[PDB]
Design a protein around this ligand. Structure first.
Ligand SMILES: [K+]
Ligand SMILES: [K+]
Ligand SMILES: [K+]
Ligand SMILES: [K+]
Ligand SMILES: [K+]
Ligand SMILES: [K+]
Ligand SMILES: [K+]
Ligand SMILES: [K+]
Ligand SMILES: [K+]
Ligand SMILES: [Mg+2]
Ligand SMILES: [Mg+2]
Ligand SMILES: [Mg+2]
Ligand SMILES: [Mg+2]
Ligand SMILES: [Mg+2]
Ligand SMILES: [Mg+2]
Ligand SMILES: [Mg+2]
Ligand SMILES: [Mg+2]
Ligand SMILES: [Mg+2]
Ligand SMILES: [Mg+2]
Ligand SMILES: [Mg+2]
Ligand SMILES: [Mg+2]
Ligand SMILES: [Mg+2]
Ligand SMILES: [Mg+2]
Ligand SMILES: [Mg+2]
Ligand SMILES: [Mg+2]
Ligand SMILES: [Mg+2]
Ligand SMILES: [Mg+2]
Ligand SMILES: [Mg+2]
Ligand SMILES: [Mg+2]
Ligand SMILES: [Mg+2]
Ligand SMILES: [Mg+2]
Ligand SMILES: [Mg+2]
Ligand SMILES: [Mg+2]
Ligand SMILES: [Mg+2]
Ligand SMILES: [Mg+2]
Ligand SMILES: [Mg+2]
Ligand SMILES: [Mg+2]
Ligand SMILES: [Mg+2]
Ligand SMILES: [Mg+2]
Ligand SMILES: [Mg+2]
Ligand SMILES: [Mg+2]
Ligand SMILES: [Mg+2]
Ligand SMILES: [Mg+2]
Ligand SMILES: [Mg+2]
Ligand SMILES: [Mg+2]
Ligand SMILES: [Mg+2]
Ligand SMILES: [Mg+2]
Ligand SMILES: [Mg+2]
Ligand SMILES: [Mg+2]
Ligand SMILES: [Mg+2]
Ligand SMILES: [Mg+2]
Ligand code: NA
Ligand code: NA
Ligand code: NA
Ligand code: NA
Ligand code: NA
Lengths: 221, 178, 53
RNA sequence: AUCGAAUCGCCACCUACAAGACUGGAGCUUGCUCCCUCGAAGGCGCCAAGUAUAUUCAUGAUCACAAGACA
RNA sequence: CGACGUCGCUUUUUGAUCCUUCGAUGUCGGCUCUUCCUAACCUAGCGCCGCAGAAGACGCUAAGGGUUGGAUUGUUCACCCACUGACAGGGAACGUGAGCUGGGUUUAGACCGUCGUGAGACAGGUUGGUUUUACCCUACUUAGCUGGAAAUUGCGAGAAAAAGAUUAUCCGUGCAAAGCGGACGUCGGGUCGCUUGGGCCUGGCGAGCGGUGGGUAGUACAUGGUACGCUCAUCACC
RNA sequence: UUAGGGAUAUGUGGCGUCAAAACUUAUGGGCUCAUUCUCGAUACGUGAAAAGGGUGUUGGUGGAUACAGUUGGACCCAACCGAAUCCACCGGCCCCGAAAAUGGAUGACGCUUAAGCCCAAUUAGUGAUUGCCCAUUAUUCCUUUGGUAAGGGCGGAAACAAAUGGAGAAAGUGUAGCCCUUCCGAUGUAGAUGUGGCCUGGAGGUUAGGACGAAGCUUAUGGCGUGAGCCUAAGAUGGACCGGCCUCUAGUGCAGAUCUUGGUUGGCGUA
RNA sequence: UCGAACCACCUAGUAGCUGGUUCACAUCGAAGUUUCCCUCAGGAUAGCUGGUGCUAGUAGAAGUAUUGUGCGGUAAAGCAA
RNA sequence: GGCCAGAACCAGCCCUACUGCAUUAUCCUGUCGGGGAUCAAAAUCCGGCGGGCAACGAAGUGCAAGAAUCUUGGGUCUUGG
C-alpha cells in the first residue's frame, strides 16, 4: 500500500497536485444487509468506487439467535480432507458485508474482481474517512422503510461478536471517541455557521431588488 | 385501482323449435373480466340449471351494468366456492367499498387469499348495499363511527419516479447517484 | 478420494516451538563469583557450586 | 525523464449525532387548537469578484478525444 | 406396554430388477489407520415414575470424549471366561490386497461318502497348493527458491495516517477550544520572480545542541566495558 | 423445430444481485415468522413424506346465554358488577409429527413494508382496452442455393473513329450459370441419387511453358471458391523437366484397423 | 513347444462374430414392425426410402367435417330383471 | 480519390401524436314517507311519485376506417438513391 520510490519520484518530476478518485462513502447504519449489498454490487459493476463504513451496524431480519445459528451452519462447512484451501469464514462484520457483495458479483472473472476490488469496508468510521465528505445512505435498503417495526431484527456487530469477532469493544470505544470529537468540533464552528446564515439574510437588503424578486419567484428568498 | 371484474347482465334463451315454440327467457347477473367470460358463465349456469346448451341457445343481450356514484358503503356479498376436501362452502361476508364491482372484486381477492379459491370455482350468489345498523362484524362497523380518525404510521412514502435516487446524502435531499 | 490431513505421515520430527505450563522455580541462585556455595543448603553444609564435577 | 495519454464539481457552511409508533415549541380536550424561524432545499460553482458604464475573441473557415484541464 | 387394526421412516438384512462394467473395477475374514452418522452403552446437564433411600424404568437436549483383555471357530456371526464408568449400533466401492496376511472360498495332485455303466459330478467332508509393477499426475507429509495489489501491464492516484498561506509558512501544550510556553545570530556575495523584512545556493566570523578521538577525576552497573564530570582536537547541523 | 445475415415483434420462462428486464413498478387486496438437513419460493420431478395433533394466527358454518360470562364477598347455593360471551364443526398459512453416515446447497447470495404464498393490474376512480427483457419461431429486407418452378427478351432499332458514356447480348439440363423479372422450399443418422463438382498416376488428341530456372520442397504470399481445392508472390530453395483443355484408363484421395515399415519422442540425466 | 512336438505346404482354411474402411457440395430421407426359417447377435418377405419413369395436369383425391343410412356391448348403470 | 465523417433532401418500409359511431336506467336528480344515527342533524338503507344527458377530459363499455398533405413527428450505421 505504501507508494514506491519510483512512483513518488515520478509524481515529483511531473509536479502534479494531490489527487483523490471519485469515491462514494456509504454509512451502513440501519441498512438491510442483502438490499444494501445488492445495490452496492450493481453500482460496483457500473464502475463506482465505493467505501462503506459502520458495517457492524448493518441489520438482518429475524432474531439474533437464528442469525447466529445461520452463520454457525455456514461455519461448519469446510473441506474435510484439508481445512486449509477450504471455505474461509471471516468473522468481522465488514468482511461479512464484503462476502455478501462478493457472492452477488461474478467473482471468477477479471471484470468481477475489478468491481470487488473497487470496494473498501470499515467497521465504524476511520479517521481517513471522517473528513473526506458527506456520507450517503441507500433509501431502498434502510431499516425504517424495509422492516416492519414489530418484527425482531439483528445487529450485525452483535451477531458477529458471539461467532468469533474479537474487536467489538475496540470498535465501540473508537466510535465513542470519534462522535465525541465530532460533537465538540460541531459545537465549535457553530458561530461560523450562524454568521454565514446571517450574512445570507443581510444580503437580501444589499442586493438588487429585481434579483430578490427572481429569488422569491423560484422560492429562494 | 379500478375493479378488475365488470358487472354483466346476460339475457339468453334456448333456440326456438317445434317442441318449445316460445322458449323461456333467462336473465343472469355475473361479475366477469370481459363479456366472453360472462357469456361462458351464463351458458354454464343454463346447462347446470335449465338443461340448455350453448349450441342450442341464443344470447339476446350481454351488457355491462354501470356502477353507481362512488359512495363509501357496506356491501353484503353472498358467495360460495368449491373445494375437493369440503365440497361447496357458502359464506356471507361484508366489505367496505364504493361500488358493487369493487366489493365483488375484493371478495374474490379475499377468497383467494384466505381459502385458495380461484375465480372458476367461485359462485357469487348475491351482493347488495346494506345499512350501517345491519352490519354484524365489528371490523366493518368500526368504520361507521361519526368521528373516525387515525394517524398514518409506518408508511413507506416512495418519491416520484423521476426524482427517485440510488444514493442520497444522509441528512439532506441531494442525490449523489440517481 | 484423497489423503486426509489427519493421517500420520513421515516428516520432520522435533525442533518445534512449545509453550509449557506450570514449571515451579526451585532455586534462583546467584553468581558463583558472588557466592561460591550455590548447592549448599541449611541441611547439607558441604560447600559446593551448582556445577557438577 | 521516458510520458502523448482514459477520468471532467469545488468547499475551512455537507464532511456531528439520533429518531421514523414521529425531534420546531406549547395547551388539554389526546386529536385538536394555538405560537413560531410556519416543519418539502448543505453552501457555493455554470464567464464583469457582480448584475452595470463595460470589455480582446474570427481564417481553429459547419460535427470530429475540450486544439485544455490548478476552479 | 399396547392386542385387533392402521399410518410411516430407514437401507446397518435378504429378495426383486439387469442400468453401468466381460480388449478384467482383484472376490471372504482379520490386522492396521483415519473420518463420518445418531436410532445415546458410558461420560455432561434435565424431566417423569407403581421415584422413601439405594438400585433402576421411561423420556429430552446433546456424537466433545470414550467404548477393552482372552478360550473355541478362516469365519462375519455365535458362545463362554475376565476386567470395566461403559464394554452402543452403524457408514465410508458389504472403507482399506501396487498396505499386509492368505486361514477360507474357486484350477491343475490325492483320499472318502453318495451318485453315474462310464468318462466324471456333488453351497458334502478332507489334505496340498507362485499374492507381480510406482521413477508419472494429483492427494497427503515435510523440505527449498521466488515474483506479485490493473494479482505480472496503466503512467488506473482509495492510508483503520496526519489536519491547513489547499496540509506549503517552526516546535511543544490544550478539547479539530480559549489561551499559554519556546525558537541561534551577525557581516557579505551570486542566481531567479507571492513584492511579502521573496525563494534558492554559497562565503567570513561568533554561539548552541551534538557525534568522534585524546587527556584527567570520582561513581554506578556482573566486576574488561559501557555510561556520567571537567578539558583539548576534529567533524556535522551550517 | 433449424440456407447465410439485419431489423422489428413474440413463444416458453422471467424482471433484488449473480444476469437482459419493474435502476427493488403501482397512486392493488389479503395471508404467513418457521433456533444447528438452518421456514418458503420443487410444473414434469412421487427429483421426497403420511396417519394424527396444535389455547400460533387469520377466515367461515350452525347453535346457546346476556343485564351476561370472569372475578370479589357470603352461604354447592343464591345474591354484587355493567359487558358481550359460550358450545360444536369446517377452511387458509404456519408449527409438531420428521433419525444417517466427506462439507453443501429454493442454483449461490440473500430476502421477511419479501426478493415467500394466493389473487389481480401496466403507470392507475384521470378520462379507456400493447409496462419491460431474452429464440436458429413469426413478419419484413438483402444474399445464396434448389425447384414438378412462373414469365419476358434473343430477325443486333437508328446513330456514334482516334488525339479526348462503356461493355455484353449463347434458342440455353448442368459452367464465370445467355440475360432479366417473379414465387416457394432449404436441418437430418442409416441410406439413395446428382454434380460443364475437386484431386492423383498413366494413354489417345490439342495447346503451351522451361538454363532469363522444370519437378519437388518452404510460408504472418496474398487472391479466388459455400467447399473439395485452384492461382499468384517470395525463397538470401532446387537444378531438368513440365502445365492447361477434350477424351480414355486405373494398384486414384487416410486420423485411429491392440493396422504395416522406418524414424522420432515425454518419462529422463530418471530407475 | 505336449489333454497330441516341431517344420513346410493345402492356407489369403471358414467365421450369422470383433475391429477397420481415404474428397466436397447439392436434392431427398428411414427402420427397430408383418409372415416364414434348427429361427432368437442371422436371413428371406411385405412395410418404410431413393432412383428411373409412364400416363390425356384435377381423371379412381382426402389420417377432416356435415347429412342420410348401417354396425357395436366398453365406460357407466342393475341385482328391487 | 474506389478513404473517413457530418448534414441535406427522394422513394420504400418501421414506430408513434391527433378520434368517431353505438351503448349506459340495477343509473342521475327532486320530493313525500319510512328507517337510521346523533347533543341536534346529515349520510349509509327501503318504498311511492315527478323530472332526466352522471355526458365527450362522463364512463377505463362494444366497435373504430382518424391520408404525418393540410398543420414540415421520429428511425433507417436495419434499405436503396
Ligand atoms: K481384504
Ligand atoms: K493334470
Ligand atoms: K507343504
Ligand atoms: K403487498
Ligand atoms: K392435517
Ligand atoms: K433461381
Ligand atoms: K446448357
Ligand atoms: K475418421
Ligand atoms: K527423454
Ligand atoms: Mg418505520
Ligand atoms: Mg484531448
Ligand atoms: Mg401391533
Ligand atoms: Mg445390461
Ligand atoms: Mg466383467
Ligand atoms: Mg477396462
Ligand atoms: Mg483399482
Ligand atoms: Mg437425538
Ligand atoms: Mg458423544
Ligand atoms: Mg468425533
Ligand atoms: Mg450396504
Ligand atoms: Mg470391501
Ligand atoms: Mg495385491
Ligand atoms: Mg488398495
Ligand atoms: Mg489357503
Ligand atoms: Mg483348504
Ligand atoms: Mg462347487
Ligand atoms: Mg503492477
Ligand atoms: Mg500505479
Ligand atoms: Mg453469484
Ligand atoms: Mg440487470
Ligand atoms: Mg416488491
Ligand atoms: Mg420436485
Ligand atoms: Mg427446482
Ligand atoms: Mg410434487
Ligand atoms: Mg440456503
Ligand atoms: Mg433460480
Ligand atoms: Mg390510465
Ligand atoms: Mg439437407
Ligand atoms: Mg499406377
Ligand atoms: Mg508458421
Ligand atoms: Mg489402393
Ligand atoms: Mg499418412
Ligand atoms: Mg481376406
Ligand atoms: Mg447369428
Ligand atoms: Mg465398425
Ligand atoms: Mg427433408
Ligand atoms: Mg454386435
Ligand atoms: Mg363397472
Ligand atoms: Mg341398468
Ligand atoms: Mg342378481
Ligand atoms: Mg391524421
Ligand atoms: Na448388474
Ligand atoms: Na446421564
Ligand atoms: Na425438440
Ligand atoms: Na434463420
Ligand atoms: Na430463394
Amino acid at each position: 500500500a505504501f507508494p514506491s520510490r519510483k512512483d513518488a519520484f515520478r509524481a515529483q518530476r511531473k509536479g502534479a497536485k494531490k489527487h483523490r478518485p471519485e469515491i462514494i462513502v456509504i454509512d451502513l447504519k440501519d441498512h438491510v444487509l442483502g438490499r444494501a449489498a445488492a445495490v452496492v454490487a450493481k453500482q460496483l459493476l457500473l464502475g463506482k468506487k465505493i467505501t462503506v463504513v459502520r458495517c457492524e451496524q448493518l441489520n438482518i431480519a429475524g432474531t439474533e439467535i437464528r442469525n447466529k445459528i445461520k452463520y454457525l451452519q455456514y461455519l461448519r462447512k469446510r473441506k474435510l480432507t484439508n481445512p486449509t484451501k477450504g471455505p474461509f469464514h471471516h468473522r468481522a462484520p465488514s468482511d461479512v458485508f464484503v462476502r455478501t457483495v462478493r457472492s452477488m458479483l461474478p467473482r471468477y472473472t477479471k471484470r468481477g474482481m475489478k468491481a470487488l476490488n473497487s470496494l473498501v469496508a470499515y467497521e465504524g468510521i476511520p479517521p481517513n474517512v471522517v473528513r473526506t465528505g458527506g456520507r450517503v445512505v441507500i433509501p431502498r435498503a434502510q431499516r425504517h422503510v424495509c422492516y416492519r417495526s414489530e418484527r425482531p431484527y439483528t445487529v450485525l456487530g452483535n451477531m458477529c461478536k458471539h461467532v468469533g469477532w474479537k474487536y467489538s469493544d475496540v470498535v465501540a470505544n473508537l466510535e465513542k471517541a470519534r462522535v465525541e470529537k465530532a460533537s465538540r468540533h460541531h459545537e465549535k464552528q457553530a458561530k461560523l455557521r450562524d454568521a454565514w446564515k446571517s450574512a445570507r439574510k443581510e444580503a437580501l437588503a444589499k442586493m438588487p431588488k429585481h434579483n430578490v424578486e427572481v429569488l422569491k419567484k423560484f422560492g429562494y428568498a | 385501482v379500478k375493479p378488475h371484474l365488470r358487472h354483466y347482465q346476460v339475457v339468453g334463451r334456448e333456440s326456438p323449435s317445434e317442441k318449445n315454440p316460445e322458449p323461456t327467457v333467462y336473465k343472469f347477473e355475473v361479475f366477469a373480466p370481459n363479456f366472453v367470460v360472462a357469456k361462458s358463465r351464463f351458458w354454464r349456469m343454463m346447462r347446470v340449471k335449465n338443461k340448455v346448451k350453448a349450441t342450442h341457445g341464443d344470447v339476446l343481450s350481454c351488457k355491462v351494468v354501470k356502477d353507481a356514484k362512488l359512495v363509501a358503503r357496506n356491501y353484503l356479498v353472498d358467495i360460495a366456492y368449491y373445494s375437493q376436501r369440503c365440497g361447496y362452502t357458502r359464506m356471507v361476508k361484508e366489505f367496505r367499498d364504493v361500488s358493487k364491482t369493487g366489493a365483488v372484486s375484493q371478495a374474490y381477492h379475499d377468497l383467494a387469499s384466505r381459502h385458495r379459491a380461484r375465480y372458476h370455482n367461485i359462485e357469487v350468489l348475491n351482493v347488495k348495499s346494506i345499512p350501517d345498523h345491519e352490519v354484524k362484524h365489528l371490523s366493518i362497523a368500526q368504520y361507521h363511527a361519526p368521528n373516525l380518525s387515525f394517524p398514518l404510521l409506518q408508511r413507506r412514502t416512495k418519491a416520484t419516479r423521476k426524482d427517485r435516487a440510488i444514493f442520497v446524502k444522509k441528512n439532506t435531499k441531494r442525490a449523489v447517484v440517481a | 478420494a484423497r489423503v486426509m490431513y489427519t493421517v500420520a505421515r513421515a516428516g520432520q520430527h522435533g525442533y518445534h516451538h512449545r509453550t509449557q505450563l506450570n514449571k515451579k522455580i526451585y532455586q534462583i541462585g546467584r553468581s558463583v563469583a558472588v557466592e561460591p556455595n550455590q548447592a549448599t543448603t541449611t541441611y547439607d553444609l558441604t560447600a559446593k557450586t551448582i556445577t557438577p564435577m
